[PDB]
Every structure is written in C-alpha cells, then in structure tokens.
Paper text:
Of particular interest is the Bdellovibrio bacteriovorus HD100 nucleoside diphosphate sugar (NDPS) hydrolase Bd3179 because it appears to have some of the characteristics of the Escherichia coli adenosine diphosphate ribose (ADPR) hydrolase and the guanosine diphosphate mannose (GDPM) hydrolase. Bd-NDPSase is a homodimer whose monomers are related by a non-crystallographic 2-fold axis. Each monomer comprises an N-terminal and a Nudix domain.
In fact, 46% of the buried ADPR surface in each active site is from the opposite monomer. Adenosine recognition involves hydrogen bonding by the E38’ (prime denotes a residue of the other monomer) main chain amide nitrogen and carbonyl oxygen to the adenosyl N1 and N6 respectively. As in Ec-NDPSase, Ec-ADPRase, and Mt-ADPRase, R64 of Bd-NDPSase forms a bidentate hydrogen bond through the guanidinium side chain with the β-phosphate oxygens O1β and O2β. In addition to nucleoside and phosphate recognition, Bd-NDPSase forms a network of hydrogen bonding interactions involving the three hydroxyl groups of the distal ribose. G115’ tethers both ends of an ADPR horseshoe conformation by hydrogen bonding to the hydroxyl at ribose C2 through its main chain amide nitrogen as well as to adenosine through the amide oxygen. The most distinguishing amino acid residues are K165 and D163, which form a bridge between the hydroxyl at C1 and the hydroxyl at the Cβ of T166.
Author numbering:
A (entry chain A): 1 to 182
B (entry chain B): 3 to 181
The structure:
Amino acid sequence: MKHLEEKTLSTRQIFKGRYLKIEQDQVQAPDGRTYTREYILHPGAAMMIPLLPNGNVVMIHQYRHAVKKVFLEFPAGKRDHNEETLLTAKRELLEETGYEAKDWKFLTTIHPVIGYSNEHIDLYLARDLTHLEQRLDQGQFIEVVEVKPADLMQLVLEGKVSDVKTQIGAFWLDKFLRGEWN
Amino acid sequence: HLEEKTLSTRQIFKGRYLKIEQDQVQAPDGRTYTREYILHPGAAMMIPLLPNGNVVMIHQYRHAVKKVFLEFPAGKRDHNEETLLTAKRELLEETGYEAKDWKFLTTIHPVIGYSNEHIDLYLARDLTHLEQRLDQGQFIEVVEVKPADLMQLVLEGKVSDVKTQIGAFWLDKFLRGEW
Ligand SMILES: Nc1ncnc2c1ncn2[C@@H]1O[C@H](COP(=O)(O)OP(=O)(O)OC[C@H]2O[C@@H](O)[C@H](O)[C@@H]2O)[C@@H](O)[C@H]1O
Ligand SMILES: Nc1ncnc2c1ncn2[C@@H]1O[C@H](COP(=O)(O)OP(=O)(O)OC[C@H]2O[C@@H](O)[C@H](O)[C@@H]2O)[C@@H](O)[C@H]1O
C-alpha cells in the first residue's frame, strides 16, 4: 500500500489552547502535489474493562461537555510522560473507580479519530479485582456503576453506548465472555 | 447532577480544516473550568453488503496517524443535510457504488473528550457498481472483504479505525442473526 502514502514536507504547531494542540503539515500526495493536513497532537490513552467476581463490569457515568451529555463509559485516561499504558490503566482504574486488579491483559489498540488526531487508546481487560477508594482529579466528576454484560450489550444495540471506546470494549468483552476470543 | 453549565463560549481557533470551541462552564463543585473541543459537522459511514456476501471497503492513508487504514467508506455532513444523503453521496464518490436499500444502524461519538463529532452508521444493500468520483486530496482504493476475514483482522489489531471496527461488530451481529 506504499503508493497511497503521503510524504510530510513541513510541520509546525499552529495552535495551542488551554488543552488542545494542533499541528499543521504540508504533505506531498501520490499525485506529486502539496496538501495541508491538520490534526491534534495527543499523548495516547488507556481504557480498561474491569470484570468483577460477580461477573458485572465496573463502569462510570461522566458528563462530556463536547457533546452536552452524560455517557456510560469504561474508565480511561491520558498517557502521562510517555509511560507504559499499563501504568496509565492501573492508575486510572484506582483513581476513577477505587479498584486494583491482579490480572491485566492487553486486548487491542484503537484510533478514535484517524481523520484529525494521532490519538491511540490501548484497551485492557482487568480481572481479579479488589476495592479501595476513589481519588478523583480536580474538575473530574464521575459516578461509578456495576453493569451486567448482557444489559450492556442491549444498551449498545439501543444506541445508548455511543462512546466508541466503551462500545468497542463491550464487543471485545462479549467475545471473551462467549469464549470466541482469548 | 453531573451536568456542567455553560457560562460563556468562544471560537478560539479556525485553521484550514479544524475549528475549536472554548467554553467556560460551571461544574457540580460550583467551580469554573475551561472546556475545549472541535466543532465538527457530523459524518456518515456505510457498510455496503454485496450479493456475494462480501463488503465493499477502502484503503486510505491517514496522515494524522501516518499509515494506511482499512475503512468502511465515510464522509462529513455538508450543509446540515440529512446524513443519509451524505452516505449516498460518499458511497458513490469513494467507491463508485449506489444502493437501493439503506438502513440506519446506530450513532457513535468517536471522541467525547474533545469533539462534538457524531457518526451515523448505515447498512447499504442491493448495490450497483458505477465509478468513483473522488474529491481533491482524496486518494482511495476499493477492496472487497469477506466478513469472516474482517473479524479476524479486528482480533489481530488490523482494523484500529474505531468507526470501521464498530461497523464490523454490528455486521457480525446482523450476519449471525443476533441483531
Ligand atoms: N485532518 C485533516 N486535515 C486536513 N484535511 C483533511 C483532514 N481530514 C480530512 N481532510 C480533507 O477534507 C475532506 C473531507 O473528508 P471527508 O471524506 O468528508 O471525511 P473523512 O476525512 O473521510 O472523515 C470522515 C470521518 O471518518 C473518520 O475516521 C474521521 O475522523 C471522520 O470522523 C477530504 O477531501 C480530505 O482531503
Ligand atoms: N475538552 C476538554 N477541555 C478541557 N478539559 C478537559 C477536556 N477533556 C478532558 N479534560 C480534563 O482534563 C483532564 C484529562 O483527562 P483524561 O485523562 O483525558 O480523561 P478523559 O478526558 O477521559 O480522556 C481519556 C480518553 O477518553 C476518551 O473518550 C477521550 O476522548 C480520551 O481519549 C481531566 O480532569 C478532564 O476533566
């Protein structure tokens, strides 16, 4: 697929807001011509599917101003300082929900916005959980809930799990639970 | 309860393609925070199912991530048109197909932390193969993929595009009679 590649002729950071950083590149496309590409520079993230002994999964409810709504999500956060994402996932599970896990399994890496961000999210399965306490960050508001996976899958079908990272977790979990993928 | 209340709004950036909104909001702690996110018109993605049971997919380079992706065809809403019109036009332009049977599946939000983007996913059936009509700076190859192969590619980490991976899973439930 080499003949679809675009070659970067220049890059600059075009904007830095309070949170978002934008890179503007000029690229040479397969027609030999020059096009502008803009995208967000993102450190990456981790998300985890925390499977409780009773077979429910620990999830959160969190308001997302970008969309003006509350979402049901699996816990997640940004990579800090180029850390291994396993450390991200561990830290975020403890902070957002109060849990630790003895068994961590990497499932897959996803890209949520290939059109305009370099973000990748590493998705983990966390098992053999024990509870401590929630440690929420400044400006983070999050209610923790337990969800039966069968109810989750029905929520997906019904359009109530629109958060792509979480919906994808749900489908991988479904695969794991029916024993098709391990 | 969890809702944040908008106190002020500003469009802080508009480049060649991206537009960023910056809001001051009041959160449940009563405190003021900044929220910044891309303003995106919305998009449609199309799962085009062929009489032979394969699906039409595309390879496209994505500079944000610096590699070529396997994707279902997709594009952005033009002028707040109905996303089914977006879907019909992009399927024609990206792949050269038209479909006489369209079904909305679901709406996904690919980046709830920093974009208002939504993508509406559709199933397209009863197809006729015309020719592509690509936009400028748009370079795309069309491939047929067997859904069983597509699911193995998902397992292997080779369909990392969230919208397409989600399409694959919905196709799987449909094809298995589950949904
Ligand atoms: N980040 C970008 N920077 C510069 N130009 C872009 C970018 N993304 C797209 N373009 C250009 O703008 C046009 C609009 O593209 P569409 O087909 O409407 O949308 P596409 O880029 O396919 O994305 C639609 C959807 O797919 C998703 O994975 C993507 O994140 C978006 O949600 C194209 O001709 C393309 O060359
Ligand atoms: N658009 C935004 N504007 C301002 N502040 C933000 C924004 N998004 C997040 N924050 C805040 O900055 C901190 C960064 O949190 P993250 O570790 O990014 O947690 P989250 O926002 O969940 O991001 C993890 C991931 O989840 C995805 O769905 C999301 O799009 C991102 O990839 C949090 O305290 C959060 O409240």
